[PDB]
Write a protein that binds this ligand. Structure first.
Ligand SMILES: *[C@@H]1O[C@H](CO)[C@@H](O[C@@H]2O[C@H](CO)[C@@H](O)[C@H](O)[C@H]2NC(C)=O)[C@H](O)[C@H]1NC(C)=O
Ligand SMILES: *[C@@H]1O[C@H](CO)[C@@H](O[C@@H]2O[C@H](CO)[C@@H](O)[C@H](O)[C@H]2NC(C)=O)[C@H](O)[C@H]1NC(C)=O
Lengths: 540, 540
């Protein structure tokens, strides 16, 4: 007949085809390849978004990486010898605005390491899922968990309460816990520990958090900036018209300023020219492109928007350039010039540290990882199984046990490589829509991720306004869970609203979950006491 | 029979009963009184929330009422005569932190005016609806437009782009516009001008906006404070541990500070003691009290939470006191000590000013008032008519012509008295449930508002953490509109999400609507262009 059908029959009748059970699942070899291609197309925006978001965390960079700076900017530090001229030893302020050039270079190196680590963790998770579990599920570091890890647990440039190494240790312990509770088979049981309204509204809260991240300056398009009174107003004026903030002291006459050692912000307050920053408008154009491609059911909408914005930003001498005429910009362009590069992780791999176990914030972060990973994993696996028709009358899909162990092992490996916990994604459904039924789809996605290596220079040149609109639209897609919340019932509307609004407003998934669980418990205390008295018999 | 039944039969056969059509609507006199009481109880939280929010707008006064301050705080301004000692002329910074004692005298005096103006607008609006339209609809300044008028159009202490007097002129003209388009009868027709996702998600966006205000410091319980990096984190540390911010200049060596004339913020940045401010915990207790009463279907849930928090804050020497041991706090207690007082509006009444018509921000606010009021009034009235069974097969409720013209007339009067536009509340549905059918219910609510006067001292003593949880819980109830947004459709999910999220993030209803309408128009340009070519005939 045709060469394509000959290939399909040869693969299906071979040992590898029988091992993957292609015949018993009615999926051919090329069907699995097409499903993997579609899954990678709908998933590959991670290679930009997750790597950049983890890059904001600062990685393993510390104050030791900041170089001493001369008294005046006009003299290079080696020539900083003269009257009234001295070199300033770095402090904790070296990490934040104005960022020490040494710390910035360390952050770029960490960005390359984290691109490679994210790709490697996704590859290893996909391979484990395809081989050990034999399911068309593609694994990659999660969106909300990654954002929580970077901006809340470790914070921007390590401003959080837990260091990056200790957060990696938390992720590793979380993976070990999942391995333990999935070897027994209790993950389905712990999928009911959390309250229902919290369970549904956590996704919408995480989506709002991601959209708010995408509406900021350091990794979004702008449009949300500091306000002295209202605390948040319309940003997206040009970067030349943005100024920093430092804490001050007020008195009954005038504002005698400068609390010494105060943490100066970035460039968040807009002085004039609102709605005029070209980077924000380029982000809006990419947003429109992604939105149209999502409306038209075009696979890779996120990819097309990111690529368009990044390619416009790759030009050297524009206002939207990703390589400004600076030493750091010149280095970024020099690294981007070599299109293909094989990068070896040097700082992030094996960067675990169990020193901060005793701290309360460590356990808060670990419990948050447990809760969020449980919700995402149990929801997505059963949604996928319903998509693929693997759900029987009992409600299981045969390989669920190995699927959960694969996810836990992939989380452990990602922690060892130095990334946020890795999930099966909802976009895996795309492959299932394309006919993907066996683990060969995961193998194909892993091969695509492998080819996504040797392209670190193209992935490290993706600007913030390119990361940008993908976050907003990911939040839009996550928002759809609000439909099955009974907003008429206050016992369910109040905890759900509280969770959903605290995640973006406290800027913390942990704080949103804690607030929602506390509100649920408080609002149901009366009912639980009534039921306890009824069981005891004081009431009828 | 009974004296109660004798009263019902006497009025029903009287001229007043026949004019109100009690017999033809099967509602008795006491039924309207119970309905009016239930409507007032369900909506009485405006007497706390409304006046407080408009008070933050700064009212009518300006830097002219800030008093000159001595060089040092330790010397009273009259005794400010000595070597190196001088009186500081007030500037625009007198209005903001640290607030000039002269300007702080306004807000207390303006708050008393805005308590009466809120009641008088509510009283007159209820009477006109009760008499001219004969419907059980209670009119009061809207919750969402209140916050937009105070915090966005005029801004906190007049920091916005439009002065309070000009914003009143916007409301007056905006009131005239409906009076014109309701006399013709087109207000039903303009209910379709807005896109469907924008109309539905505007309520949820406003609810997020209102809950966002309830989580701030100047009008809420706290728990949301400034962050140097993330721009929002967990506030609600004690007020002694909050510090201000002033814009600064960064260089390549160090942050040489103080952009001269920069707008110093309030007390938004928390240094330590997070989750330890007693005022926030008092608000949470009030939040729990309202939530349980809302759950238990207890009428007046908002008031009980407001009253309990306000009553605890009335004690003089606690950490949650509403009258701190200051000169302003002593004056607040002195005015509170006289329980009953008849207040005459002296600054706010008739404070219109058409000087700023030519400015663009004036028309942005006026059109935003026009849009917001169209969605609120048309949606509420038909929901009320469905509740009261006044909707015929044609979909009208007979007295709709005067119902819209009554609402327009009340808005004009409210602007003259100096409040935000007044609407029929959704809480008007409450009295309809107990049997409110004629305009006598509105008269009864009007009488209660009359009794709400002579209690300005008790209403001007309501602290920010008492306003607080009602705003959060009003945001919860407004959030129920999300259920009829097709979140599967990106042509509706994206504009709805954008509309919903910009209102609390840009912290502006106008920006949320402009973004949502712009996103709706852009995302439908391809479809409209396709159908335009189909009508022309280039396509099939
Ligand atoms: C860092 O370099 C700046 C110059 O940009 C220095 O700024 C000083 O502070 C203000 C702002 O310019 C001026 O009034 C001073 O004259 C500046 N000093 C000098 C010598 O020009 C600042 O001195 C430098 N900071 C440190 C710690 O050396
Ligand atoms: C305003 O009040 C302060 C006291 O709170 C006055 O004293 C100044 O305080 C700052 C530090 O808080 C010192 O750096 C200044 O040297 C102090 N000034 C003097 C003369 O001692 C301050 O003088 C007052 N400022 C104005 C403009 O009146």
């Amino acid at each position: 007949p045709k060469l394509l059908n000959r290939l399909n029959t040869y693969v299906g009748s071979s040992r590898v085809g029988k091992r993957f059970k292609l015949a018993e699942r009615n999926s051919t070899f090329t069907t699995e390849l097409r499903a993997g291609t579609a899954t990678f197309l709908t998933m590959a925006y991670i290679l930009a978004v997750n790597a950049s978001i983890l890059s904001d965390s600062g990685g393993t960079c510390s104050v030791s990486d900041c170089i001493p700076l001369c008294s005046n900017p006009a003299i290079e530090p080696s020539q900083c010898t003269g009257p009234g001229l001295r070199l300033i030893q770095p402090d904790v302020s070296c990490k934040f605005n104005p960022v020490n050039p040494g710390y910035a270079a360390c952050v770029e190196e960490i960005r390359k390491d984290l691109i490679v680590a994210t790709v490697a963790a996704s590859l290893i998770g996909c391979v484990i899922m395809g081989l050990m579990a034999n399911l068309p599920l593609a694994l990659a570091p999660g969106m909300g968990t990654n954002a929580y890890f970077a901006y809340t647990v470790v914070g921007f440039h390590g401003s959080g309460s837990i260091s990056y190494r200790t957060a990696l240790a938390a992720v590793f312990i979380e993976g070990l816990i999942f391995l333990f509770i999935s070897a027994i088979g209790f993950r389905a049981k712990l999928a009911k520990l959390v309250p229902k309204p919290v369970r549904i509204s956590s996704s919408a809260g995480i989506g709002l958090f991601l959209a708010f991240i995408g509406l900021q300056n350091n990794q979004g398009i702008g449009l949300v900036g500091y306000s002295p009174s209202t605390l948040v107003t319309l940003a997206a004026c040009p970067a030349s018209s943005r100024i920093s903030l430092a804490p001050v002291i007020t008195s009954a006459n005038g504002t005698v300023s400068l609390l010494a050692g105060g943490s100066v912000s970035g460039d968040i307050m807009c002085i004039h020219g609102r709605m005029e920053s070209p980077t924000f408008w380029l982000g809006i154009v990419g947003f429109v492109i992604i939105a149209y491609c999502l409306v038209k059911n075009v696979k890779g909408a996120m990819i097309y928007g990111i690529v368009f914005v990044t390619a416009v930003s790759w030009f050297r001498n524009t206002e939207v350039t990703a390589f400004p005429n600076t030493s750091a910009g010149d280095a970024a362009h020099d690294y981007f010039k070599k299109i293909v590069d094989v990068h070896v992780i040097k700082h992030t791999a094996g960067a675990l540290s169990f020193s901060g176990i005793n701290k309360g914030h460590f356990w808060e972060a670990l419990v948050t990882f447990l809760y969020v990973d449980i919700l995402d994993t149990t929801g997505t696996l059963y949604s996928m199984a319903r998509f693929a028709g693997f759900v029987d009358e009992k409600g299981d899909f045969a390989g669920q046990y190995f699927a959960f162990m694969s996810d836990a092992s992939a989380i452990v490996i990602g922690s060892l490589l130095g990334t946020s916990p890795v999930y099966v994604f909802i976009e895996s459904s795309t492959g299932i829509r394309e006919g993907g039924r066996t683990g060969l789809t995961a193998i194909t996605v892993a091969v695509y991720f492998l080819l996504a290596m040797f392209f670190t220079p193209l992935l490290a040149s993706i600007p913030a306004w390119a990361v940008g609109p993908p976050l907003i639209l990911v939040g839009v897609m996550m928002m759809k869970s609000v439909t099955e919340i009974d907003w008429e019932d206050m016992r369910e509307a109040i905890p759900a609203f509280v969770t959903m609004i605290l995640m973006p407003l406290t800027y913390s998934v942990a704080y949103g979950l804690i607030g929602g669980i506390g509100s649920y418990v408080v609002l149901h205390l009366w009912d639980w006491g009534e039921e306890g008295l009824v069981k005891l018999g004081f009431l009828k």
